[PDB]
UniProtKB/Swiss-Prot annotation:
Residues modified as N6-succinyllysine: 3, 22, 110, 116, 205, 383, 489, 495, 521, 545, 563, 577, 600, 661, 695, 702
Function summary: Catalyzes the isomerization of citrate to isocitrate via cis-aconitate.
Region Disordered, residue ranges: 496-532
Subunit (UniProt): Monomer.
UniProt cross-references to Gene3D superfamilies, sorted A to Z: Aconitase, Domain 2, Aconitase, domain 3, Aconitase, domain 4
PTM annotation (N6-acetyllysine): residues: 22, 110, 116, 205, 489, 495, 545, 577, 695, 702, 708, 715
Protein name in UniProt: Aconitate hydratase, mitochondrial
Length: 753
């Protein structure tokens, strides 16, 4: 066909639209129905399109992703498991991005220099394992994983997996980009088929066009309010309609990015001329030209069926701000001042934060600078503190060159390194004490309790970068940029004009400094050294194979009440230090979950000593004494970030099963991967039949089978027993992971020894 390379760094790896077309055509001759766009890309990547069983919401697809991307808080454990597989080189284009371990304190260059010193052991490990196994390495300072991927690696029709739940960001360039745990990335780096439950497809038809203050962020702030955080589970969101041409390519990436907050498998937009324009301005006109020749396969089929349709009229959409402790609590900016007042949310904004991968594009920085130049023209600066995170080095060099960074510095902003920083709590925040109630507004995406600064009483609202800038200047939520007046230095009242800015630089992007490190694909004789006394890195010891017996008289470690995110199960912030060390990070296990017994966090009853204490310590005491335990949870257990640490930590501390009303997708997969049993109540009311003191027996593991429920005997203290049934979503592939002790153990069994 064409020999067009997948990126500038892999001149030999060609895009295979011929393969994609061939597979789409085998599959549509079988289904004889129109295919949505996500169906074309996903089924076009099937390992076996002729025989694969295809039913939305029901079958597991065996897929062949084109490339793997990892960020440094999840890459360490993905690479420690790849190192245990014993395989010599990764089988597909793979990258590591060092963006999660740079703490915001002093701003830019200073914070990067400090991070490089503090994290030297880890950056060393990743660069060395990268050179040895043939993984490309983007150095600290290079940028946030998803911005580097949009700028260099994402293209129409790619199937990309990344160890991060905002990998869907890449849907803004017509690709299917899916968040996974490190063990799924090991499957693909090892060359074995990746499995994904066939998704449902929610269509969102966009009509009209954006105007004035309304920006691409408002479309997904509105969709999250409609669908709620559990509304997109098991589905891909596919944007279509005449209003799509109205959104810039980075705007589409913003909307696809935050679809992670409704639990969606990923989101995607159809190839159109805005993507073509972005590919040409990022050095990839040859890929835009090839995609023009395969355009029919990069847009949905006429009359394709969506399982749910939502219509949004862009012309009527007005600015939104969401939170404070969930991303689906949506409010127009116009009314948040009044709702805050009513609910007792602090009206004064201590810090306004723009950027992160969700909103750090050139157009986002241009629009925020456009609001900031007006305030400056009246002698004002920010009343709130104000920080700016550029998404990559190229965006930092280009907004610097085109003068937007200086406007943002002149209004009182501090430019932070090109890293997650405050978005995952890597922020040395000193202005409030812990427990001090206060309000910050961000252009980020998640706004859950204690995530930006480990303070549970910080009320974080997410909105667009131009609204964070307008509200940082005002310093209060009781300010609506569309209606209200500010007073200049000079005494005159003035109103902020809606920001207008270029979506891409008129000149080319300035690439900034050299930050990519290609693997020697020659040499590769590196020794990865993990010191046996390291506190940050530890080689894995394999988990135990299943004993062949049912699980009797299991102790409940904790019955969790309400929302239990992966930040409740395995907190980030300070714990990021231990992402490569399983025993040390297991000291945060479930310390944020609320115990139904006393409604406290990190205070559970030890069944032996009858002292209430920390959950980590109690799980280690049960493990030390041979007591196998269980977690009982509520709805959407495991919501949020993809960290497989939330599944590895309970396995390590002696857990056996997690029984809930429902699971978020990535956590449920991660639990199966590590040899635990994620089970759901066949009747959710049965959650109320189980009390912290009850012991449980799970029976029927001997004839464990796809579609057959497991029986659970609840043993009450008084001698009463109640039998209930538990469903699971294991297929046969996954039951083998459980029997072997973990998926990695099963893979090492298939290597003939
Ligand atoms: S923590 Fe924030 S900036 Fe970093 S990859 Fe995730 S969403 Fe993006």
């Amino acid at each position: 066909r064409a020999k067009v390379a997948m990126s500038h760094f892999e001149p030999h790896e060609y895009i295979r639209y011929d393969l994609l077309e061939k597979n789409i055509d085998i599959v549509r001759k079988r289904l004889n129905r129109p295919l949505t766009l996500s169906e074309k890309i996903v089924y076009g990547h099937l390992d076996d399109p002729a025989n694969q069983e295809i039913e939305r919401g029901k079958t597991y697809l065996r897929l062949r992703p084109d490339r793997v991307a990892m960020q440094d808080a999840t890459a360490q454990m993905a690479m420690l498991q790849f190192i245990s597989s014993g395989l010599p080189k990764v089988a597909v284009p793979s990258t590591i991005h060092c963006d999660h371990l740079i703490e915001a304190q002093l701003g830019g260059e200073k914070d990067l220099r400090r991070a490089k010193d503090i994290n030297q052991e880890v950056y060393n490990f990743l660069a060395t394992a990268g050179a040895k196994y043939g993984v490309g390495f983007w150095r600290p300072g290079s940028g946030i994983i998803h911005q580097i991927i949009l700028e260099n690696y994402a293209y129409p029709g790619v199937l990309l997996i990344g160890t991060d739940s905002h990998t869907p960001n890449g849907g803004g360039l017509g690709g299917i980009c899916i968040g996974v745990g490190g063990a799924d990335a090991v499957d693909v780096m090892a060359g074995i088929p990746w499995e994904l439950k066939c998704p449902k497809v929610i269509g969102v038809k966009l009509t009209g066009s954006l105007s004035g203050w309304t920006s691409p962020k408002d479309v997904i702030l509105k969709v999250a309010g409609i669908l709620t955080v559990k509304g997109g589970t098991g589905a891909i969101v596919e944007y279509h309609g005449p209003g799509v041409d109205s959104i810039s390519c980075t705007g589409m990436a913003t909307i696809c990015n935050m679809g992670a907050e409704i639990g969606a498998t990923t989101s995607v937009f159809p190839y159109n001329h805005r993507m073509k324009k972005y590919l040409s301005k990022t050095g990839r006109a040859d890929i835009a030209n090839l995609a023009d020749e395969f355009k029919d396969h990069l847009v949905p089929d006429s009359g394709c069926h969506y399982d749910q349709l939502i219509e949004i009229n862009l012309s009527e959409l007005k600015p939104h701000i969401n939170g404070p402790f969930t991303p689906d609590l949506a409010h127009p900016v116009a009314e948040v001042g009044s709702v805050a007042e009513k609910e007792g949310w602090p009206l004064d904004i201590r810090v306004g934060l723009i950027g992160s991968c969700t909103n750090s594009s050139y157009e986002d920085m241009g629009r925020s600078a456009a609001v900031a130049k007006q305030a400056l023209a009246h002698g004002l600066k920010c009343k709130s503190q104000f920080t700016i995170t550029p998404g990559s080095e190229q965006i930092r060099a280009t907004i610097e060159r085109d003068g937007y960074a200086q406007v943002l510095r002149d209004v009182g902003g501090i430019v932070l390194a090109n890293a997650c920083g405050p978005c995952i709590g890597q922020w040395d925040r000193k202005d409030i004490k812990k427990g001090e109630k206060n309000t910050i507004v961000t252009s980020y995406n998640r706004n859950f309790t204690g995530r930006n600064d480990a303070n549970p009483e910080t009320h974080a609202f997410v909105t667009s970068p131009e609204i964070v800038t307008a509200l940082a200047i005002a310093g209060t939520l009781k300010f609506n940029p569309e209606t209200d007046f500010l007073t200049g230095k000079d005494g005159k009242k003035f109103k902020l004009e809606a920001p207008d800015a270029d979506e891409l630089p008129r000149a080319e992007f300035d690439p900034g400094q050299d930050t990519y490190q290609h693997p020697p694909k020659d040499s590769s004789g590196q020794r990865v050294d993990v010191s046996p006394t390291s506190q940050r890195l530890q080689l894995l010891e394999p988990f135990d194979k299943w004993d062949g017996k049912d699980l009797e008289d299991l102790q409940i470690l904790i019955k969790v009440k309400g929302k239990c995110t992966t930040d409740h199960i395995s907190a980030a912030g300070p714990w990021l230090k231990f992402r490569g060390h399983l025993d040390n990070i297991s000291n945060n296990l479930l310390i944020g979950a609320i115990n139904s017994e006393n409604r406290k966090a990190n205070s559970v009853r030890n069944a032996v000593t009858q002292e209430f204490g920390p959950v980590p310590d109690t799980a280690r005491y049960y493990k030390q004494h041979g007591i196998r335990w269980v977690v009982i949870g509520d709805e959407n257990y495991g919501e949020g970030s993809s960290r497989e640490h939330r599944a590895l930590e309970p396995r390590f501390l002696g857990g056996r099963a997690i029984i809930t009303k429902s699971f978020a997708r990535i956590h449920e997969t991660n639990l199966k991967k590590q040899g635990l049993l994620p089970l759901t109540f066949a009747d959710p009311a049965d959650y109320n039949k189980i009390h912290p003191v009850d012991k449980l027996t799970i029976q029927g593991l001997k004839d464990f089978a796809p579609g057959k429920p497991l029986t659970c005997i609840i043993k009450h203290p008084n001698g009463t027993q109640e039998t209930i049934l538990l469903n699971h979503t294991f297929n046969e592939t996954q039951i083998e992971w459980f029997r072997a002790g973990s998926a990695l153990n099963r893979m090492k069994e298939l290597q003939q020894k």
